[PDB]
Amino acid sequence: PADALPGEGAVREVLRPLLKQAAEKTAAGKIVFAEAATGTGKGRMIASLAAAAAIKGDTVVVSAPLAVTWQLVNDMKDIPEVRRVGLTLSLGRPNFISPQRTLEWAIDNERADLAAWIEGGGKPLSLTSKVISHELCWLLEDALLLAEDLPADSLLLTSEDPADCPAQQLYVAMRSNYTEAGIILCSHFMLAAHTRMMQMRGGLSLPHFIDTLIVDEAHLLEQAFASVYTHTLRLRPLMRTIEGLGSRGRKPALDALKELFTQMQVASARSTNTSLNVPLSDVPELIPALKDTVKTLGALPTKGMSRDARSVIRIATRAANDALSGHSRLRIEVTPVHSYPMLLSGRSNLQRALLGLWNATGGATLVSATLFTTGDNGSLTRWKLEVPTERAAFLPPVHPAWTTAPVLLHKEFCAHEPDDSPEWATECAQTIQGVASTAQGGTLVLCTSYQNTELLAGRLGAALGDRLIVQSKTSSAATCLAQFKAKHKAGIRPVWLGLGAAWTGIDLSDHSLPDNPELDRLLSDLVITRIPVGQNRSLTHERRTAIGGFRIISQEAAWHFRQGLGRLVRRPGVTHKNLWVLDARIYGGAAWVAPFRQILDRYKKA
């Protein structure tokens, strides 16, 4: 209550010592790893840290996704020092998508939910924000919640987009309200795009040196960086756009694109393997094609092209050049198995970019509920974010008793090992049907693939009917979340066969009871069908496993698993929470299942 940080009285009691340690280690120039349980009030802690740093005179940047950005703004504006120093939102173009190209892609890939969201105006899905300029639509994060495999490289809002575009107009209207404030709030994608732009030089305007950086939900940061260095070449819309231009240079570009298509099919059939990402040296059939594809793309004149063709051809050239850089790993999707022709080029190492970020950062604090793999072991996270080992500071985690006290772990499990077989599907569906018959509220059932989900759906559909919500490629995660909330509100007890984002991001606390968490029954039964092994399909995870062995696989599996468990208790004061783990390998007496058996032992069984 004296000689304290701004807004520290609003920070919950449990996070105050962690707050003090983070403040100290950050002012000393260290990259702090502060893991705190969800529902403890991490937003107030972030607000107090940013306020203490901004009062000192530092340039403070808080990088957080837009979902939590609203509540972060609310928690920061409550601090008077923050309101005095100023708080702005650096909403650069990489935050927004192009409605035209996103709608076209959704149509070409038969993603009805994404098409409907674009047609409806791209309105915010989760979010509210009323005193920060206008309403934020066309957000990349919502689009990703509607299509996890969104080729964001080729669907982002560019400066070459027409002025009458809604996303462009929203960006310009937001940029007009941008002032030089003490605290700048950005997204993970904004921070990563800014770092990449700053490196490629040696509207995007972040401080060239971040005195104090505060990353919230830091377990997403790397993925953001990974997305910013991904390049996508979508051949069908590019070919269509070129078909809609003057014939002076149309024929050569179209013939070069068809040559590239044929060479991509050749390389695809050259070695099927298992969706393997190969360098350009392993598929030389694309080297001339790609080269030709670039030349013709620059040959046709801009005197006659609209802004749409301009941005499309520029993005295509950037992608084809990043493919021919040799520093990338390629993934081909063509006629044999993918109706939508596409060439992906990613970076299996983000070390230079993240090091450029940390070199331009005086001090930093990373906040999340899943920073450590076990205890305070942030080694996997440090490696992912490429934090210099001398600057990393693994503070103790904060996970109170209420995060597991209302939870009762059940002894029942599916005896047949998860082998993607119809027999496993039958047994696991019998188990899920039992859990659904006993369940008092909404039931979430996490799966590891679309195939397991389809089998479990074919079983549980005839049994449940009104209650079942099957996630798929067409049925996004957001539409399933909305169906879940609606069916729970109607009195039905829904059973959501979820995957993907259902493991990592969704907030299943009933917002109809913000002051009475004792009556929260929105998610009463969490069910884990499989240990999430092999769910990370990033190039950096491929390199990390190739270097460190099966320990990286096991640590990523435990990280994903603890995230999935973190969907059940989202706040204190809840009750009647049930946890189910059906993977027979847990109770199999193996060696690699020892980490998981730790967390599950931490609960109380019944």
Author numbering: 104 to 230, 235 to 309, 323 to 726
Sentences from the paper on this structure:
CRISPR-associated DinG protein (CasDinG) is essential to type IV-A CRISPR function. Here, we demonstrate that CasDinG from Pseudomonas aeruginosa strain 83 is an ATP-dependent 5′-3′ DNA translocase that unwinds double-stranded (ds)DNA and RNA/DNA hybrids. The crystal structure of CasDinG reveals a superfamily 2 helicase core of two RecA-like domains with three accessory domains (N-terminal, arch, and vestigial FeS). CasDinG is an essential component of the type IV-A CRISPR Cas system, which clears bacteria of invasive nucleic acid and silences gene expression.
We solved the structure by molecular replacement using an AlphaFold2 model of N-terminally truncated CasDinG. The CasDinG structure reveals a SF2 helicase core of two RecA-like helicase domains (HD1 and HD2) and two accessory domains inserted within HD1 (vFe/S and arch domain). An N-terminal domain of 103 amino acids was not observed in the electron density. The alignment revealed that the HD domains of CasDinG are in a wider, or ‘extra open’, conformation than the HD domains of the binary E. coli DinG structure. The extra open conformation may be a crystallographic artifact, or the result of having no ssDNA bound in the CasDinG structure. The first insert (residues 195–275) consists of a four alpha-helix bundle that aligns with the E. coli DinG FeS cluster domain with an RMSD of 2.3 Å using the Coot Secondary Structure Matching tool. Despite this conserved topology, CasDinG lacks three of the four cysteines observed in E. coli DinG that coordinate the FeS cluster, and no FeS cluster is observed in the electron density of the CasDinG structure. In CasDinG, the lack of a stabilizing FeS cluster is compensated for by a salt bridge formed between residues R204 and D269. Notably, analysis of CasDinG crystal packing suggests that the vFeS position that sterically blocks ssDNA binding is likely a crystallographic artifact, indicating a conformational rearrangement of the domain that allows for ssDNA would likely be allowed in solution.
